Amino acid sequence: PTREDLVATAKLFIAKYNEFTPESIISVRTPNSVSHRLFPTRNATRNIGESMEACANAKEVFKSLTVSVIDDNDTIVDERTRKVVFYLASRGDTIVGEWKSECIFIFQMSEDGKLVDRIWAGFDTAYMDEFESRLDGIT
Amino acid sequence: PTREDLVATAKLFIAKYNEFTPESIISVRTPNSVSHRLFPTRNATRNIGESMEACANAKEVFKSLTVSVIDDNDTIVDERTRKVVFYLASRGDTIVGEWKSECIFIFQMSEDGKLVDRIWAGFDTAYMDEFESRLDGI
Numbered sequence: 001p002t003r004e005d006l007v008a009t010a011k012l013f014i015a016k017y018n019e020f021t022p023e024s025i026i027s028v029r030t031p032n033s034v035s036h037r038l039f040p041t042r043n044a045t046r047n048i049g050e051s052m053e054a055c056a057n058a059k060e061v062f063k064s065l066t067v068s069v070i071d072d073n074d075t076i077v078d079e080r081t082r083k084v085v086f087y088l089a090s091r092g093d094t095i096v097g098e099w100k101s102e103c104i105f106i107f108q109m110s111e112d113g114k115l116v117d118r119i120w121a122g123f124d125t126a127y128m129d130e131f132e133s134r135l136d137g138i139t
Numbered sequence: 140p141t142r143e144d145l146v147a148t149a150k151l152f153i154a155k156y157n158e159f160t161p162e163s164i165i166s167v168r169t170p171n172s173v174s175h176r177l178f179p180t181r182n183a184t185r186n187i188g189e190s191m192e193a194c195a196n197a198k199e200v201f202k203s204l205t206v207s208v209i210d211d212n213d214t215i216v217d218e219r220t221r222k223v224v225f226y227l228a229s230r231g232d233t234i235v236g237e238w239k240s241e242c243i244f245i246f247q248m249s250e251d252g253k254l255v256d257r258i259w260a261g262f263d264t265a266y267m268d269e270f271e272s273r274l275d276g277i
């Protein structure tokens with residue numbers, strides 16, 4: 001698959017992910033696909049079923065979510081390994097208010113470049129801890 | 140520059156980084172290169188002189204620092220944009236105990252592929268916060 005094919009599938013993943021339902025967020029993944037969280041403090045690996053469950057729980061907190069590529073010129077594409085790297089802004093409306101952060105997403109596409117076979121997500125882990133403290137303060 | 144040329148320059152950057160002196164941390168960078176921190180909570184930007192000053196300050200805390208690419212299968216190379224992505228383990232001995240973390244480094248090489256012209260570094264920011272809080276205890 002071409003560089004443009006690979007970025008296209010990654011942008012489709014992002015679009016479905018912004019719909020943020022258990023079905024939409026696996027919409028563009030292979031059946032054996034795995035989702036990794038980077039960094040020791042939030043280490044995690046989720047197959048298709050755990051990703052759906054995770055999204056269902058998150059929906060209790062996140063009313064709507066928009067992740068967007070901050071600059072398409074910053075996107076990294078490796079045609080040999082079928083990987084795309086996005087640096088994304090994340091904006092959310094939540095039960096404790098505004099969510100505003102940035103994250104790095106890495107996608108490895110399937111052999112035909114049409115599905116996402118593997119994801120690595122790198123979040124601002126200090127911001128996540130600060131958000132969890134906000135959740136701990138509902139009255 | 141080939142895929143292998145880009146990778147070799149990033150591996151050379153890491154090799155010299157591990158010598159951990161202001162001299163070594165600039166020795167594979169272009170003179171006008173800038174180093175970015177990813178993530179809002181840690182956002183910063185360092186030219187060459189600022190990177191030397193920060194290394195000098197770090198060596199007052201870090202007795203040693205060692206970085207390594209965990210698995211070459213993880214590495215991402217974009218020949219068109221001349222970028223290499225490494226996922227790294229970092230370990231160091233500190234005046235407040237052990238430093239142990241992981242980080243993502245993105246390099247963009249010069250046009251001839253032989254130097255690092257731009258760096259983006261993504262750290263575990265909660266771990267970094269906690270390490271700074273270990274330093275606040277004196």
Ligand SMILES: [Ca+2]
Pocket residue numbers: 095096097
């Ligand atoms: Ca509320």
Ligand SMILES: [Ca+2]
Pocket residue numbers: 132136
């Ligand atoms: Ca909690």
Ligand SMILES: [Ca+2]
Pocket residue numbers: 196199
């Ligand atoms: Ca100092």
Ligand SMILES: [Ca+2]
Pocket residue numbers: 271272275
């Ligand atoms: Ca402090």
